[model samples]
Target: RSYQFWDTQPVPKLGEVVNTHGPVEPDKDNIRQEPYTLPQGFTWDALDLGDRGVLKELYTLLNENYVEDDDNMFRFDYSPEFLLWALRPPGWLPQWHCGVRVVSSRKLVGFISAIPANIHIYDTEKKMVEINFLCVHKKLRSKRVAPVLIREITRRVHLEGIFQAVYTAGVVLPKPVGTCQYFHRSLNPRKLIEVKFSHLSRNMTMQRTMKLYRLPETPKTAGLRPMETKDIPVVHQLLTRYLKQFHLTPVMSQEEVEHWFYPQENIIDTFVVENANGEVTDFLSFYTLPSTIMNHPTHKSLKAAYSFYNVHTQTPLLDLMSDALVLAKMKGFDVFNMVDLMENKTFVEKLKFGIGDGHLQYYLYNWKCPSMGAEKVGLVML
Candidate 1:
């Protein structure tokens, strides 16, 4: 199938091989000076997330229309607090929080956002935007809202003088820099089976499945404790040094590190291994996102933990991730999800995480690189 909008965009065609790494089109001397006009009965609004009413409107828009599983078993139910934390990172702009509202009802119906970041691609360090939260109301699917959302976000990003971007999605488009599979570990097998997220194997009982996934009550790593605000500097250094192992990764500052991994209850969690010498040797973290179990008789939500970043030097990778499972279970998470990117292949199978059905394809807006395997990809997005 031909991708109509993507064909006109600056991306490689399907299965096209790229020889070098750079922008597909050189930075333009002349960029669009005005926002793309929406269809009649709709107007653009730069959302003010600081205002409680505006935030709730965005929350409602996404909660009702965001991505759902292929089987429609579950939908991402990102909380209001998680939205604030994920969207307004360092160098966030209110204008980038783009929304489309109906002229008559003034109801929010479409949205897209971009946040600036420094990413390393091969030998080059480039400043770029990470596009996320591109959602449109369900009733407007045939209105060509998504293309406008993409174009507007691109125009706004170009106005900032940045010509590159990165994003991931479940659907296959014109091209993908990398494709990764999702692997899920069952923390609450019973609830997962109940919600139809998973199924029972032949001749297997619920008791047997529970026994197979049970983890010890506590993590075995010594000197592992909740990360503190003061440990930000060392954790930043450790993570930066660790990320250099991959071909593509983000360059995060100490403040960004602290904001991402500072152990927010039911939002983000981080733990670090500090030896007797007070040196940070290893760290692990995950963010919580729950999904509403629609139409279930009793269950309402599924608490899930997504692996964020884990760097293990002194500890074995398997042991560190086993501890992650223990921690997630202790915190009442129903399942833990991760993509088969980075060094995750080393432990995902041995730790017994089942492969999920969908593929997360990574794409660059105006940049192209040689196609690569999942392990070479280092970036993670919410």
Candidate 2:
């Protein structure tokens, strides 16, 4: 497939050999003065997710027409609370929450968002925006609205003096800096099978599969408890040291660390192990993201826990993840999902996590670098 739209952007093209790492284009002397014009009868609006009415509108737009699997079995159901938490991180901008609305009816038709992040790409630390939730109504896709949305969001970010961006997509655009596969651990094997999210194996029975994925009732690790306000400093230090080993990683401030890693009821959860010596040794966190079941008889929503940042110092990674599983299961999460990035490769297979058919590709706009393996990719976008 030819990359008609992406070829015009600052990304590396397919089959283009690169030998260096840096921005492909320098900041323009004259930035785009006016907002990118939309097609006839459509206009762009900056979404204020704080408004209950506006938030529900965006939620409905995504819930009805968001990305689905290859077979269209399930789609992401990001709650309004999740959106508020994800979009308003630390230095979030209102205009960066770009949206397209019908000119006459004022209905939201397309949307894209960018959140500021201080990232360390190998040697240099750069402040960039993580672009996500680029969605358009099914009827408006062929109108070439997506490109305009991209352009408008880029202009907004550039106006803020941030030129670089990192995003992920399932499709192959011009190029990808890194690609990673997905792995799943079933918390409710019965519900998964009922929804056709997974199938019974060649020689496996339902009862056997249930027993296979069952976890302990409680975590075996001593001193493992919910992350408190006091643990923020220690977690920040631990994460800072742990993330330095990767080629691509986030450089979070203490405030950003607390905002991202601290526990938020039914939204984000973090656990830290405090040893008897009063030193925080390990940290584990996961965010709650659910999927809207498409026309299932008995189920309406599927609760999923995505593994977030985790670090181990005194305890083994395997043992840390074991406790994570126990916590997620006890909380009633139906499934646990994670990408094959970071040090997750060490424990994913050993813990009976099944390989998912989805592939998430990491992309950088206005930046070029050699392709990287999954282990070197450490940044996890919400």
Candidate 3:
């Protein structure tokens, strides 16, 4: 569990390196330890989302790959606003943060996330680094630059006192990790079938995990009532219970939820599924991209809604997405996207949603989800 580099000096960020350990700290001789440089013909820089150029490139990068790639389409939802909220320490929006940019011919092409994690211990453990929003220009993949970018990110983590970091990818890696499972639900299947959007099918298959309960038939309330800040306390409690069933949960506080999901939080227009009695049984959160990075300038941006995060306190909560999707679609989100639980297979078959390539592969770190007693996958690589 111990890494050798801990014995020497930490790593360095771009344009910053310390050689006091007599140039021997990082075993540069090893292919894995060598200078983490950009692929040939590409240059590197860290960009802040606020930077117009960086933001522009972020959109461009997602469009190039998007959910269409072998990687998870969920990453396609990483808008500037999204990063500003969900990212943790050393987040994409670090005030002192520079965005990761690997450019070719002065045009941004590839990127990695670098934020300052508050390492109560070594930077590797909790004061962590989370790398997401990584991408390589479609035309630039032949050079095997992802590894290089990863290496550079490794160096960046080192410089910041981060001896190790954490991240996830759509595909299985030669390296390893502590994996976690994610659950989702589908809302618009007729449309999901039409767009041939299939990635959420796994979520559909995963639904058998939840205990089905019978309750009063809940009709969608026709109202513009938006989620209020005051409702967050009760909402947070429900969300915690619902998600904790999966076993792995983000240590998000109620304030964090309010900051991330409140309608004012970028006006994402998150709403609740209220019953006839006016009690909220379920909730949904989603956002729209005025211009999609996928086909910017020519293609209209995606007007998409998602079961971003929800907490259903009652049986009717399952159908909350029903109303949310209609709201998002009516508001001009061209495509209403969703993810269903991977364990729930029946609803997906009934709804007839096509499969897309995005999946949140689950693994365990230090513990296991009680549900996947035997089928659990293994992880531990840092």
Query: What lDDT does candidate 1 reach at residue 70?
Result: 91
Order the candidates by lDDT, highest first. Answer: 1, 2, 3
Error of 1 at 107 (Å): 0.4
The clash number for model 2 is 0
Estimate, for each residue in 180-267, the C-alpha lDDT of model 3 and write its tens digit.
3333333433333333333333555423322121122333644325788767876677665665444223444676567656784433
lDDT of 1 by residue, 1-382 (tens): 8887999999999978799888889998889999998999999999999999999999999888998999887889999999999999999999899999999999999999999999888888999999999999999997788999999999998988999998999999978989999999999999999989889978999999999999999999987899998789888988999999898889997878988888999899999999888888999999999997878989999999999999888988888899999999999999999999999988887999999998999988888888779998898899
What is the lDDT of every predicted structure here? Answer: 0.92, 0.91, 0.47
Clashing pairs in 1: none
> Could you list the CA RMSD of all candidates, in the order they appear?
0.9, 0.9, 10.1
TM-score for each predicted model, relative to the true structure? 0.98, 0.98, 0.61
* Residue 30, model 1, lDDT: 88
Candidate 3 regions off by >4 Å? 1-35, 39-42, 65-67, 70-105, 114-129, 158-166, 174-224, 264-267, 273-281, 289-302, 342-354, 357-360, 363-382
lDDT of 1 at 6: 93
State the local distance difference test value for candidate 2. Answer: 0.91
